[PDB]
Amino acid sequence: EWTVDKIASALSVLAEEVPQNHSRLVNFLLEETEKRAPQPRHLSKTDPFAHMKSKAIGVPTMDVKFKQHSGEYGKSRNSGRRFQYPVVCIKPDREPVPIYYFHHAEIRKNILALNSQLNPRSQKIAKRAQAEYAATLAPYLEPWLRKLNIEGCTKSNLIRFMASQPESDDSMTPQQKSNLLDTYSDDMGSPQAVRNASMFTEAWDRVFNDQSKLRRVALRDILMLDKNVEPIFDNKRAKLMQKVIDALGSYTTLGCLICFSHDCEHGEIERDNQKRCFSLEEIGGLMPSLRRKWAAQIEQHPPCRNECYRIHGNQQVPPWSENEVGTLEWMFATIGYSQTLRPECFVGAILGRPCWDVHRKLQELPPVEPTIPKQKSLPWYDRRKKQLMSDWADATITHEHAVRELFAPCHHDGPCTAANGCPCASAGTHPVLCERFCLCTAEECPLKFTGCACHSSGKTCLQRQGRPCICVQLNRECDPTLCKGCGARERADPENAYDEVLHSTGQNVALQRGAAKAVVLGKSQLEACGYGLFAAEDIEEGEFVIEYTGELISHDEGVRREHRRGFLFTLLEQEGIWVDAAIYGNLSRYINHATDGNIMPKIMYVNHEWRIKFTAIKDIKAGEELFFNYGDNFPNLTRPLLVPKTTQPLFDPLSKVQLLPGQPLPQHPIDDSWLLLKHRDNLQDFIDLRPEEKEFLQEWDAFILRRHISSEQYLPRYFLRFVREKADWLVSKRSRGEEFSKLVATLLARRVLPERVVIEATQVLNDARGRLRE
Amino acid sequence: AEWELPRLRTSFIFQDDYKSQDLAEFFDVKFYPYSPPGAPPVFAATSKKHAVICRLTQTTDKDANPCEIIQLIRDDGNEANCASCWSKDPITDQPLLCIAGNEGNVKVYNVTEGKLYRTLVGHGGGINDLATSPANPYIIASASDDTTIRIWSLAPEHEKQPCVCILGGEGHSYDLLSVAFHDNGRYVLSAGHDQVINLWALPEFPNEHMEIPIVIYYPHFSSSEIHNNLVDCVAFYGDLILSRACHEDTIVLWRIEGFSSDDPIPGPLDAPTPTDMTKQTRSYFTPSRPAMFTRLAQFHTPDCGVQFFMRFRMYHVPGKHPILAFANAKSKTFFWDLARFGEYARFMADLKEAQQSYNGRVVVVDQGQGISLAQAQQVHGPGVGVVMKPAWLVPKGFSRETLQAWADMYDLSNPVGLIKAHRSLAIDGAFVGRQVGWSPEGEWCVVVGNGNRALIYQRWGKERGL
Ligand SMILES: CC[C@H](C)n1cc(C)c2c(C(=O)NCc3c(C)cc(C)[nH]c3=O)cc(-c3ccc(N4CCNCC4)nc3)cc21
Ligand SMILES: [Zn+2]
Ligand SMILES: [Zn+2]
Ligand SMILES: [Zn+2]
Ligand SMILES: [Zn+2]
Ligand SMILES: [Zn+2]
Ligand SMILES: [Zn+2]
Ligand SMILES: [Zn+2]
Ligand SMILES: [Zn+2]
């Protein structure tokens, strides 16, 4: 039977093995390192200096005074001798490149930055000391408990004691003391077991948390490192119909509406680097999107080669796991009331089961209400003629990106009016049009954007045409899906970027095409500037030159960064987003300022991204340097392609080697591996996700991110390439196909995957398994 | 003889060459590491404008000068220099000296014939440190104000584009001061004004032209927590780390949890990325939640004050004792012999064993005499305990002040302790030390610092009878 003092006595005796083991370990590692001392390598066979005698003496000449020393004192022997020496002068054959800070890496598209810490000093120092000691002592707590063997003095019971103590208020949280006492519970056992745990805790803090010191740690500090306590204090969490909803919640929470990845550059970062994905959850989760898919369905081929239910539909088939009933439920809900596609075939290939089997477990949906309250058209925008009229530049702020705040696209149930809380009509100073991701249909809603109306066998969708181009008026590029006359479907596809004959016809998609003009880093013609950007090919006035890409950051991160560094481009002034190209960007970060520029930036809306495009305002000959007038864009928040002949030295962007007039211009493919790795690890860091979802999420994300999709026009093609290149991999493990099956499920729920590709993937997966059957 | 520490033998002062009348400094010294074993050792001392190259020859005369200056090179450009390293011509095997400074270019000098071998261009700011790889003498690493490390190759296949690798990304965010190679030549440490120490894993480099250098975005270990100030010097000691920061007056011996140079070299996609912006340490190597590094020992280095860019050097050689050397900012040169720690702990063990195995009747006897444990046992027979005490343990049974003196120099039981220098040699006049360098066979130790002064220390001399 113990006291706090007899316990503090025994912890004192047990604690003196800590320095002993330390000395043992340091001595061991020192002895080990000495033994494996490295032999000096690459010795020459001969003393290369052997032939050289002292050089002491119109040659440049320099002095050296030598002193000699002896005795333990180091006292001299005299004032010392002086000698003069000839000096060999060697000039260098090359100039340094212009000044720069950081390695400048290229990125194809803007990336979303996290907020960084700005790194009282004494509290920082003291916490580090305490942390280092907590790690020293943690390995000892359980061997010592074992050795003392005081009833109720177990690691778990000391964790329970801590959670019940008055410091559970300043340290802990709703759900923090909840799920602590979920894994552990409250009961500490006998009345004497609770007394022991509390006397122990106090003896520990008396022995090791001596407030006189810097090397000091509370028991609480050590218990917090426990692998079962630590997850409770880690804020990296990703989160009949309620069956499906919960099955797809990973995909409806993480999957991006713009680019279809689950870790991408879209969405919002909060002050604590919690991220709201731009996902189905920002527009109401699964249900509003799905109840609408059905409502469109009610208001309206060949067999699978896996023993089609269409022909068969005995016994002798294995029992069904609940994992694989769910798999058929959620493919049944999100295919819904289809005519051209049924679950059985596709479930049949997701699970290794015959198509007739899933039909006799299937054979063995909430009602959908049909209303269209007819709204009067706004006088400033006809969506059927796709045209704006009269005072339109005053009624809306759809084109004034600087004044616009971002909102979740509307997902209400009625008309898009202030009365129903529609953000589009009413959140801003004025109405903005509803976009691709709003659940209205430009059929219900007069505010819906319908694309432009241009068609021309020549060039169209130009900066000024008889009827203007509504997309150009709204300062946006054309939508590959809405703008069906201009050729946007083919010209915004990056696979046609260098089809020069395609792009000589049909002109407002330069950012999505992704082809910049040929340009080249060099030393700027301007005194007091370092680097500049030089055109490498002739650019005609009006042509798009390049995009300003970089890290997207918020106002306060921008401030933190201007401090930390002792050039932050404004993208959205009122929302407070800036593009920072100090490290990540492209060659447009090197364009210099001139009041009389030859290019000009414009903020463009591009399929629910905002982006900075540079356009020529004069003819620019190859070799000319590019300037634009900075203006307010940079606030203080606090025919082979050839190196042109130019007066100024030019550089490879990476090697900083100097380019020679007329050799081939270096076009280096963009290195994105380091960027995939960050996104792979951001998914891995979620505590909310099982290993089997992580594995598939990370495999899809690695594929789809390299494609930078901005538009659902191109998803079905890349979705097909994924199932082809990965079908061998998807039928290997049963976890993988079921995860696949949820992705497909939530893409169907958004009507974003045509079912002509779902029946096609059913083929590739049945085939893939037929070749696995070896 | 093996226990001998150095003593001052020669000092010289090189004429002021950054004139404003006496602020000139020697910033680097390095002995040539590629001479056949036993050749007379040669070293280069780098001032702001000159490379002083001197041969050291042991003497029998206490008053002879062992030092002969065989070559003297001036950088005729506008640069001020502060970093050097050695390499070799890949075709001829002649010594090359690499010199680097504030214009951002590495000059490579053919020093036996007073010509420029070539220039390495590409850094966007001043270079503060150079290091040759122990595994390949044609591979040099440079640490720059521009935040990056560049890896250069003098091998013939890379003459048209010699930067084979840039260590960039967001590992460092201010000027780097220190770069160091592991012995295997694939692990590189970097440190600077941002207080971050980084460990990078270099790829194998193709033995053919590279139009661009490999770029590495993520170090495999990274921490700003080992020090609380700017880090100005870093080095491997085998697999262990030695490092130093301004205002701390220590050299920290520490290790990375789970790092062994006997495991396979991780690739670049094994690196840890910064998914958590509040974590100040991340590591690929981590084997309840453990430390990612652990402090081992702290060599006490008093009176550096606010001076930074002061560098230490360990002598680490098969079959000789490891010696850490460092000169502070008040004119003192400190030495530690790392093999005294084991012999002291071994001595204190035999002492405490025998003070219980004989109830205190223990006579302690010096080694380094003609007297064995066997001869000394004969003098009192099996009645008494005889324990052999290292000759270099000098008193200040044993006194309390003697035990505290010995514990201060040799006890490795406190990772936040301060291990006193084993020898502490005073320097005449005001002297801030910048760099230390050892001869191949370790009989010479050269310390260069301000006033363009070099202090030359010897041990194992041949002097006799003035
Ligand atoms: C961290 C410090 C500060 C915030 N910072 C950040 C960066 C990216 C950067 C750079 C740099 O990466 N530039 C390349 C470059 C770009 C990116 C764009 C254009 C149009 N043009 C360019 O060159 C350079 C300098 C700097 C300092 C002193 C200096 N002088 C001093 C006395 N006179 C001689 C030289 N010159 C340049 C600072 C930088
Ligand atoms: Zn996205
Ligand atoms: Zn079928
Ligand atoms: Zn609405
Ligand atoms: Zn809307
Ligand atoms: Zn609407
Ligand atoms: Zn148009
Ligand atoms: Zn359009
Ligand atoms: Zn168009």
Numbering used by the authors:
A (entry chain B): 196 to 252, 261 to 322, 360 to 479, 492 to 552, 567 to 579, 584 to 634, 639 to 644, 646 to 740, ...
B (entry chain A): 7 to 25, 34 to 301, 307 to 415, 489 to 558
What does the paper say about this structure?
Polycomb Repressive Complex 2 (PRC2) is a histone methyltransferase complex composed of core subunits Ezh2 (or Ezh1), Eed, Suz12 and Rbbp4.
Based on our structural analysis, we introduced several “humanizing” mutations (hm) into the SET and SAL domains of ctEzh2. This region was mutated to resemble residues of the human Ezh2, under the assumption that this may result in a tighter drug-binding pocket. We next sought to solve the crystal structure of hmPRC2 bound to GSK126 to determine whether the humanizing mutations actually resulted in a tighter drug-binding pocket on the molecular level. The co-crystal structure of GSK126-bound hmPRC2 was solved at 2.65 Å resolution. Despite a lower overall resolution compared to the wiltype structure, the hmPRC2 structure exhibits an improved electron density map for GSK126 that enclosed the entirety of the drug compared to the wild-type complex (compare hmPRC2 on left to ctPRC2 on right). The body and tail of the inhibitor in hmPRC2 are shifted to a location that is akin to the human PRC2-GSK126 structure. However, it should be noted that additional electron density was apparent for the sec-butyl arm of GSK126 in the hmPRC2 structure that was missing in the ctPRC2 version. hmPRC2 contained replacements of residues 849–855 of the SET domain with human residues in attempts to impose an improvement of drug binding. However, electron density is largely missing for this region in the hmPRC2 structure, implying that it did not fold in the same manner as the bona fide human version, at least in the current format (compared to Fig. S5B).
